[PDB]
Design a binder for this molecule. Structure first.
Ligand SMILES: Nc1nc2c(ncn2[C@@H]2O[C@H](COP(=O)(O)OP(=O)(O)O)[C@@H](O)[C@H]2O)c(=O)[nH]1
Ligand code: FES
Ligand SMILES: [K+]
Ligand SMILES: [Mg+2]
Ligand SMILES: [Mg+2]
Ligand SMILES: [Mg+2]
Ligand SMILES: [Mg+2]
Ligand SMILES: [Mg+2]
Ligand SMILES: [Mg+2]
Ligand SMILES: [Mg+2]
Ligand SMILES: [Mg+2]
Ligand SMILES: [Zn+2]
Lengths: 82, 38, 175, 222, 43, 316, 101, 162, 167
RNA sequence: ACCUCGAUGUUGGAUCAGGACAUCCCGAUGGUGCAGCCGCUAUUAAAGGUUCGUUUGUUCAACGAUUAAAGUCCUACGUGAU
RNA sequence: CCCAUAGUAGGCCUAAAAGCAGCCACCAAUUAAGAAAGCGUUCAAGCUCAACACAAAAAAUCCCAAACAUAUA
């Protein structure tokens, strides 16, 4: 019975306006802003697969987050058989 | 009490104890986990 | 106790799934449905709204409403109705980084992000990996010239799933 | 701060198309019409084949002689396939299918009457031979749990090992011979016929050097 | 109690025999004498 | 976690008969005694015996294994038959294999076979004859029957307590007695009438189990904003499963009146006045004797209906 | 933490812990306050409060426990370990609860 | 050492920790290069259960064994001393380290049986009804296996089973 | 019997004597290695996380001038995050660093007298602007949260010094 | 196929039994899908007890009525110069 | 030993199956936490962990030498 709200299928409308941003019925669709208005940190993020352990700088928190996560993966596999 | 040649704890509450010459497994949470060394 | 669940906006039902859950705690089911619908009237009906329920010892409840799930924001922005069956071997949707910034600007106002007081840079970074689960691929620059081809080919692939899905049902009937 | 160390990645490891062990039949396709002598010397002494790893890294090392019949294969095959991960593990057979015929007479058999009819087939195994070899995207601790369970049900004394453990085991025995403070060894006395000891020894004892007695292998003998 | 089936020192189930301390010393003493015999036969 | 005993799936394994010895006898003089293997003993049977003492099917064992008959020995020694196994079941228990109604139990003392024990294999001496001087064949013991039993006991519920949860059905059950829960009401004249409720729509599984009742009691909370709406939904769900269950006599009961004292909601039920309703508080035990006296009279009509059915009216 | 939560601060009325952080003999006293101020222990008895007053008077650390019956328990943590203080404190919890009931 | 005393005045309980005199190690150890106090004094393999002077320095006033990390002993000698302490109480050589008896308890009169070199607790030993054959005799343990390497001045080694 | 038997066949007495005499004898050192002074352990290279914390810790003492040392009590995560949200409103950070990393930094540094404070679970309340008055009222919500002390403008102050500075 | 072929026929019963405990009953004690009665299972316990009949040469078994129970065995498959 | 809040009931498929019916991918807020290694739920809830900090034995007349860890082989 319960279903997700119907979403419009129009390439022109999707590019011009973001449908999911507006949630109020009496509200209006929020138009997307041009590239220059958005900040610099938005268009330099890792869109693809995560960087491997070797590619990260050792003197960084994200490098040790990856190593700590892999240790948790190693510990879980050992405990699986036990 | 179930006699076992090898005594294995069946949960985190089981604890080994040396009494009367043979090891015993006591578990107050699960009374069926009690074992006696054979 | 505290119970958290996702409830469709303005479509709360006295029956399952939250019905039996409230019955155990003793919370009045009809009062919850009335309060939720009267509070979610402004929001469009059917929107998945994660709800947090606070239960008092005297069977008194005070509903709490948070921001909609990121999946609704991502799917609506790309026009996709349903997520992909497989991830990485196929592309379900296609959104821009501008879509993520417009989505994160409101999703970061929820209770969880507000209490942490983290910058929007970390909020956008958490949505990029969320779209990966749904199969949506994010491109820095996108135009309607290349979006219309991908969406046209997506429907072709979706029709292929319909052929496979109907084939499985027909085989099940023969069993 | 808890110490953090890099862990090996098995991404380069590849898995065959049939990780599970192939089914083992009771008897070979071609029956043996002619019966064979018992030849108990085929399980006596060290193994001269299948003593090194081929594809995997972990294997069940046999520390004694014995015969494997169809029942033994089923226990190993069912246990390993169920308890292992097909995605990241694979196993192969390091022993052939049952081929040596075993003749058993009907109940009530008195002495005589010639050789009995063929009853079942077995696979003789010598000490130091690898029975089942495993490998893939898995550590030694992951597989040691059920491999010792499989090795425990073998008719002979066995123990799961790896490339490093087996190498360390061999190096330890070599170390024991070098630093042994006993001036008298089995090899020296047996070869030189000291005290006329060869009257109570066997011709195989010149090569076994006291480490093998019947089908039993003694790792503590230097 | 303590019956050994059949005869003591023959058969499948024989009475176990153990090496005493002086038994080891006697064999070692024999070995030393013969080890010296190997030396005088080498020249 | 204590519950009233209801349909429970039990496993019965009959005894397997023993095989023959298949041996030959020898004596110093004759030196050819002939066959002397004795027949194997027959396996025990599993019998469901009705007992009036056990009102409830409390004795529910995980599995039932009959004693296998001993195999025959030398000198024509017949094997001992396996000891029979008896299971205690209340009167009126329905035993089925999940596909059909196998049998029904009439009264105390009735015994029904649910697992045949295996027969005993004949020894080699059974085949001895003038033409067959030295038979050697033996008969293997037939294995005993092992089947899955779907023991279904008609719950003894002269009254059925139905309603949406949090209304107080279990609390009321505790008061009068002082996943189905069953209690007993003891009244004057040594008359005992039982009442059942299932604390958790309500589901088809609940309706089928509550179908095995004689009277239905509807419980509606006084704090409910629309007590009449709750009445219709429970009735409609029951009516959807079966219109006949609605024809059964009912009694609308308002609960939780002690603390709320919602007299406005009380007048609403009286305004509708579909039938004579009863207003009581389970927590404080107010006006319980009023309904309990009426409930006993209601079952009296069912005893007359039991005469038309011909089945015993459950000891009362 | 877990050991004291199983017992509960049912008869406890108020807990006051004072220490001088700059001194080098308040390690157990601070760790004792760590266990008492835990959510599991405090959730058992909401009425009971925990008081922590930091002073720079160079005085010895002491722990004051106020019970409903009116008796007081004073533990000087300068020369007592956290386990010793917890064991002594938890022992009085069982004694006072039995006397009250 | 450290002592704890509780004094109650005016229904108020006060717990205090007072430091007492602490004994000091004797100066000029014979072997300063040792790691644990045993070999620092060349006492390795040179003490027995009857040397209560050595054992009293590693026990509590109630006869309990002291922790290894406090006394500083090695794992090997701590177990050897632990077994010698157990055999010392059983032999009656430590009358001043008896267990603390709670108030209102009077021990019953029990058979005073002299014993020594008792490996196991007396209450946990079953009698040997069937000795068995000569080649499979059930021997009675005497002493402790952990003292197998002690300096023996006799040609016959210690007999640990009778 | 056969040369190879399923059971352990009993050896001839002469062979059994030969086996007993020719048994492995491990070498026995004159002095047990454990009793002799062990050689110094090989140097342990510092973990990149540890050298990352030192750079981050040194920035805290240099960038922000007000540092408040408190005991991170075992508060519930909901209540511990809520106070951090209150501190973030007044631009007050709640940084936590291990003692085994922070102590060596303060051993040879200007803030050498803050060493005895860091014993156990500790947390640092830091801000570029010393909003002591706004911070104190946040901490007064929980009477069981102790304010150990701090150092404002390179001057070490106790809890009472913050109270006087706040007023 | 080792002992007995220069006087034990074997089976069963009667008589009287000694012994093992791997306990059928009585006793003590854990677990239980042990509410209570009944049960199941395990540890401990051999001091005491362990029926009478029909057909059958019977041992055994079938069923007849009982009993707290109608134990498994060994003893020259106990005992036949009783 | 202590501890555990969060982008979320990750999507697919499923009456709903949420870290734990199955499966595709396994990123990520935060000092520090598995798109979950086990239990418990029709499904949820609840729980732990990973994270920060601090090696046996029993048969039938009645067990079976007596015993003894310490004086130089
Ligand atoms: N005040 C009041 N409370 C009641 C009464 N009956 C039940 N309750 C409440 O209902 C709770 C139990 O509900 P329950 O029996 O499980 O409802 P059911 O699921 O419909 O059977 C208890 O906590 C009681 O406080 C009543 O007559 N008066
Ligand atoms: S380290 Fe030398 S005896 Fe303890
Ligand atoms: K004669
Ligand atoms: Mg003999
Ligand atoms: Mg209920
Ligand atoms: Mg031969
Ligand atoms: Mg017994
Ligand atoms: Mg006879
Ligand atoms: Mg006779
Ligand atoms: Mg006679
Ligand atoms: Mg942990
Ligand atoms: Zn347990």
């Amino acid at each position: 019975a319960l279903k997700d709200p119907d979403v419009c299928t129009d390439p022109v409308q999707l590019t011009t306006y973001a449908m999911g941003v507006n949630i109020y019925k009496e509200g209006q669709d929020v138009p997307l802003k041009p590239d220059a208005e958005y900040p610099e940190w938005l268009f330099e993020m890792n869109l693809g697969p995560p960087k491997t352990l070797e590619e990260l700088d050792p003197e960084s928190r994200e490098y040790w987050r990856r190593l700590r996560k892999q240790n948790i993966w190693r510990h879980n596999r050992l405990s699986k058989n036990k | 009490f179930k006699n076992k040649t090898v005594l294995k704890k069946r949960c985190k509450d089981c604890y080994l104890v040396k009494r009367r010459g043979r090891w015993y497994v006591y578990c107050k949470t699960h009374p069926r986990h009690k074992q006696r060394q054979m | 106790g505290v119970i958290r669940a996702i409830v469709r906006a303005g479509l709360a039902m006295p029956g399952p799934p939250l019905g039996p859950v409230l019955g155990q705690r003793g919370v009045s089911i009809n009062q919850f449905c009335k309060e939720f619908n009267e509070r979610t009237k402004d929001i469009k009906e059917g929107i998945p709204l994660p709800t947090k329920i606070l239960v008092k010892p005297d069977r008194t409840f005070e509903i709490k409403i948070g921001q909609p799930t990121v999946s609704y924001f991502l799917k609506a922005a790309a026009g996709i109705e349903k997520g992909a069956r497989q991830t990485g071997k196929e592309v379900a949707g296609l959104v821009t980084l501008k879509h993520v910034y417009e989505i994160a600007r409101i999703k970061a106002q929820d209770e969880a992000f507000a209490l942490q007081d983290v910058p929007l840079s970390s909020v956008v970074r958490s949505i990029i990996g969320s779209a990966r689960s749904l199969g949506i691929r994010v491109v820095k620059d996108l135009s309607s010239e290349e979006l219309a081809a991908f969406q046209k080919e997506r429907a072709i692939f979706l029709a292929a799933q319909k052929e496979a899905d109907l084939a499985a049902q027909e085989e099940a009937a023969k069993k | 701060v808890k110490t953090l160390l890099p862990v090996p990645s098995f991404e380069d490891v590849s898995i065959p198309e049939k990780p599970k062990l192939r089914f083992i039949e009771r008897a070979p396709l071609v029956p043996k019409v002619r019966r064979e002598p018992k030849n108990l010397s085929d399980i006596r002494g060290p193994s001269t084949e299948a003593t090194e790893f081929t594809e995997g890294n972990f294997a069940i090392l046999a520390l004694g002689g014995g015969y494997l019949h169809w029942g033994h294969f089923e226990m190993m095959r069912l246990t390993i396939n169920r308890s292992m991960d097909p995605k990241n593990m694979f196993a192969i057979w390091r022993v052939p299918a049952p081929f040596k015929p075993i003749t058993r007479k009907s109940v009530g058999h008195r002495m005589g009457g010639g050789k009995g009819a063929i009853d079942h087939y077995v696979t003789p195994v010598k000490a130091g031979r690898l029975v089942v070899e495993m490998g893939g995207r898995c550590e030694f601790e992951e597989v040691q749990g059920f491999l010792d369970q499989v090795a425990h049900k073998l008719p002979f004394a066995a123990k799961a090992v790896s490339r490093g453990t087996l190498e360390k085991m061999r190096k330890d025995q070599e170390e024991r011979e070098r630093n042994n403070q006993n001036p008298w060894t089995f090899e020296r006395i047996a070869t030189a016929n000291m005290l006329g000891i060869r009257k109570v020894l066997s011709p195989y004892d010149l090569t076994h050097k006291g480490k093998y007695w019947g089908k039993f292998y003694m790792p503590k003998r230097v | 109690r303590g019956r050994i089936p059949g005869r003591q020192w023959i058969g499948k189930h024989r009475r176990p025999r153990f090496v005493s301390l002086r038994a080891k010393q006697n064999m070692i003493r024999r070995l030393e004498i013969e080890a010296e015999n190997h030396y005088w036969l080498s020249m | 976690k204590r519950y009233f005993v209801d349909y429970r799936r039990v496993l019965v394994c009959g005894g397997n008969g023993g095989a023959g010895a298949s041996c030959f006898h020898s004596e110093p003089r004759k030196e050819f005694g002939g066959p002397d293997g004795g027949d194997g003993g027959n396996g025990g049977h599993v019998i469901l015996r009705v007992d009036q003492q056990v009102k409830s099917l409390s004795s529910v064992l995980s599995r039932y294994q009959g004693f296998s008959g001993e195999d025959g020995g030398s000198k024509n020694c017949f094997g001992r038959s396996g000891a029979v196994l008896y299971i205690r079941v209340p009167v009126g228990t329905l035993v089925k294999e999940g596909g059909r109604v196998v049998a029904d139990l009439s009264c105390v003392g009735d015994e029904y076979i649910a697992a045949l024990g295996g027969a005993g294999g004949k020894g080699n001496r059974f085949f001895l004859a003038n033409n067959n001087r030295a038979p050697v064949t033996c008969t293997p013991g037939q294995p005993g029957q092992q089947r899955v039993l779907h023991l279904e006991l008609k719950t003894v519920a002269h009254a059925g307590m139905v309603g949406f949860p949090n209304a107080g059905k279990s609390s009321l059950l505790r008061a009068i007695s002082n996943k189905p829960h069953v209690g007993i009401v003891h009244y004057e004249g040594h008359l005992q009438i039982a009442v059942a409720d299932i604390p958790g729509g309500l589901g088809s599984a609940f309706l089928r189990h509550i179908e095995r009742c004689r009277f239905l009691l509807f419980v509606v909370d006084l704090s409910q904003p629309e007590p009449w709406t709750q009445v219709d939904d429970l009735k409609y769900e029951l009516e959807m499963y079966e219109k006949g269950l609605s024809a059964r006599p009912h009694a609308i009961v308002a609960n939780k009146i002690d603390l709320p004292e919602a007299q406005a909601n009380l007048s609403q039920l009286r305004d509708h006045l579909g039938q004579e309703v009863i207003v009581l508080s389970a927590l404080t035990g107010e006006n319980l004797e009023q309904l309990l006296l009426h409930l006993k009279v209601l079952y009296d009509a069912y005893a007359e209906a039991e005469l038309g059915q011909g089945r015993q009216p459950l000891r009362w | 933490a877990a050991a004291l939560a199983r017992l509960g601060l049912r008869p406890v009325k108020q807990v006051r812990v004072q220490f001088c952080p700059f001194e080098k003999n308040v390690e157990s006293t601070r760790t004792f306050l760590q266990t008492v101020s835990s959510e599991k222990v405090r959730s058992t008895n909401l009425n009971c409060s925990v008081i922590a007053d930091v002073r720079h008077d160079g005085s010895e650390p002491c722990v004051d426990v106020l019970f409903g019956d009116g008796h007081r328990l004073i533990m000087r943590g300068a020369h007592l370990t956290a386990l010793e203080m917890l064991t002594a404190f938890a022992s009085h919890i069982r004694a006072r609860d039995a006397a009250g009931s | 050492f450290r002592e704890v005393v509780e004094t109650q005045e005016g229904k108020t309980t006060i717990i205090e920790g007072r430091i007492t005199a602490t004994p000091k190690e004797s100066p000029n150890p014979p072997n300063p290069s040792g790691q644990c106090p045993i070999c620092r004094w060349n006492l390795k393999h040179k003490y027995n259960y009857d040397d209560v002077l050595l054992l009293s320095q590693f026990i509590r006033p109630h006869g309990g064994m002291l922790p290894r990390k406090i006394t500083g002993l090695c794992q090997e000698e701590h177990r050897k001393i632990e077994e010698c302490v157990k055999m010392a109480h059983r032999a009656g050589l430590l009358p001043n380290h008896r267990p603390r008896l709670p108030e209102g308890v009077v021990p019953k009169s029990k058979p005073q049986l002299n014993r020594y070199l008792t490996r196991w607790a007396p209450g946990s030993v079953k009698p040997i009804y069937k000795k068995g054959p000569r080649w499979n005799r059930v021997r009675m343990p005497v002493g402790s296996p952990l003292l197998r390497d002690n300096v023996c001045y006799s040609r016959t080694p210690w007999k640990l089973y009778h | 019997s056969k040369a190879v038997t399923r059971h352990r066949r009993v050896m001839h007495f002469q062979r059994q004597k030969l086996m007993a005499v020719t048994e492995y004898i491990p070498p026995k050192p004159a002095i047990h290695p454990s009793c002799l002074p062990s050689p110094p352990s090989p140097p342990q290279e510092e973990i990149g996380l540890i050298r990352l914390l030192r750079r981050e810790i040194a920035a805290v003492f240099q960038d922000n001038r007000m540092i408040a040392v408190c005991q991170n009590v075992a508060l519930s995560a909901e209540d511990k995050l809520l106070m951090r949200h209150q501190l973030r409103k007044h631009k007050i950070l709640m940084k936590v660093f291990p003692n085994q990393v922070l102590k060596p930094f303060l051993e040879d540094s200007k803030y050498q007298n803050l060493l005895p404070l860091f014993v156990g679970h500790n947390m640092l309340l830091v801000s570029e602007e010393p909003k002591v008055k706004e911070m104190v009222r946040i901490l007064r919500t929980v009477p069981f949260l102790p304010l150990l002390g701090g150092c404002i403008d390179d001057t070490i102050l106790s809890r009472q010094g913050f109270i006087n500075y706040s007023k």
